[PDB]
């Protein structure tokens, strides 16, 4: 069906989404879920902020759409095409880049294909369980302990760390045999819907 969540709106703006939702019988919810079909983003004239809802949207291959879908629809008295209003970027990517699109289409082939990820140590402006949920939506398998990575040569483990929230270490590598990367690895990867090369995000491991 149609189920929307909203991000970056003022209350007045949200009321217009609410109005639109009434005229159309679309569901409007506070929290994103799997049922959520739509993520309505405040854009600048379709570049938005990178929010959790933005990530959980691309990650779920959803309709991540500019608030312009709504106003323009209201202004024309009917539901326009999501296609025409799809967001295209934020700060991992300026306008062009069609992250939500790569995403919305790919679903067979997901960016975290056959990976094992340990979100490790403390994180900030995003709860661990939401980063983990994101990571699964993208295809990864979640691992909770450094020591529980599967010993089957079949998979690729990865440790994810947000170096700030700590004071994890560059000593992770002493405790396992996985590349250790920063959270942006996942976040940039998710925005673009393109598994990014680890090189740029890899963190120093002390022998
Ligand atoms: Ni390999």
Curated annotation (Swiss-Prot):
Consequence when changing residue 163 to S: In ovarian cancer; uncertain significance
Annotated consequence of substituting residue 41 to R: In BC; uncertain significance
Domain BRCT: 1-87, 107-203
Effect seen on changing residue 22 to E: Impairs formation of a heterotetramer with ABRAXAS1
Impact noted for substituting residue 71 to A: In BC; benign; functionally neutral in vitro; no effect on in vitro phosphorylation by ATR
Effect of residue 50 to Q: In BC; pathogenic; strongly reduces affinity for a BRIP1 phosphopeptide; functionally impaired in vitro
Outcome reported for the amino acid change (mutating residue 90 to G): In BC; uncertain significance; functionally impaired in vitro
Effect of residue 14 to S: Does not abolish ABRAXAS1 binding, but abolishes formation of a heterotetramer with ABRAXAS1
Outcome, altering residue 7 to F: In BC; uncertain significance; functionally impaired in vitro
Listed result of changing residue 145 to D: In BC; uncertain significance; functionally neutral in vitro
UniProt modification remark: Phosphorylated in response to IR, UV, and various stimuli that cause checkpoint activation, probably by ATM or ATR. Phosphorylation by AURKA regulates centrosomal microtubule nucleation. Autoubiquitinated, undergoes 'Lys-6'-linked polyubiquitination. 'Lys-6'-linked polyubiquitination does not promote degradation.
Outcome recorded upon mutating residue 3 to F: In BC; uncertain significance
Result when mutating residue 127 to S: In ovarian cancer; uncertain significance
Coiled coil: none
Outcome of substituting residue 3 to P: In BC; uncertain significance
Effect of residue 137 to P: In BROVCA1; uncertain significance
Domain of life: Eukaryota
UniProt-reported outcome of changing residue 97 to Q: In BC; uncertain significance
Consequence recorded when altering residue 86 to K: In BC; uncertain significance
Subcellular location: Nucleus; Chromosome; Cytoplasm
Consequence when changing residue 8 to D: No effect on affinity for a BRIP1 phosphopeptide
Subunit structure, as described in the record: Heterodimer with BARD1. Part of the BRCA1-associated genome surveillance complex (BASC), which contains BRCA1, MSH2, MSH6, MLH1, ATM, BLM, PMS2 and the MRE11-RAD50-NBN protein (MRN) complex. This association could be a dynamic process changing throughout the cell cycle and within subnuclear domains. Component of the BRCA1-A complex, at least composed of BRCA1, BARD1, UIMC1/RAP80, ABRAXAS1, BRCC3/BRCC36, BABAM2 and BABAM1/NBA1. Interacts (via the BRCT domains) with ABRAXAS1 (phosphorylated form); this is important for recruitment to sites of DNA damage.
Primary role: E3 ubiquitin-protein ligase that specifically mediates the formation of 'Lys-6'-linked polyubiquitin chains and plays a central role in DNA repair by facilitating cellular responses to DNA damage. It is unclear whether it also mediates the formation of other types of polyubiquitin chains. The BRCA1-BARD1 heterodimer coordinates a diverse range of cellular pathways such as DNA damage repair, ubiquitination and transcriptional regulation to maintain genomic stability. Regulates centrosomal microtubule nucleation.
This protein's domain notes: The BRCT domains recognize and bind phosphorylated pSXXF motif on proteins. The interaction with the phosphorylated pSXXF motif of ABRAXAS1, recruits BRCA1 at DNA damage sites. The RING-type zinc finger domain interacts with BAP1.
Implicated disorder: Breast cancer: A common malignancy originating from breast epithelial tissue. Breast neoplasms can be distinguished by their histologic pattern. Invasive ductal carcinoma is by far the most common type. Breast cancer is etiologically and genetically heterogeneous. Important genetic factors have been indicated by familial occurrence and bilateral involvement. Mutations at more than one locus can be involved in different families or even in the same case.
Name this protein carries in UniProt: Breast cancer type 1 susceptibility protein
Organism this protein belongs to: Homo sapiens (Human)
Gene: BRCA1
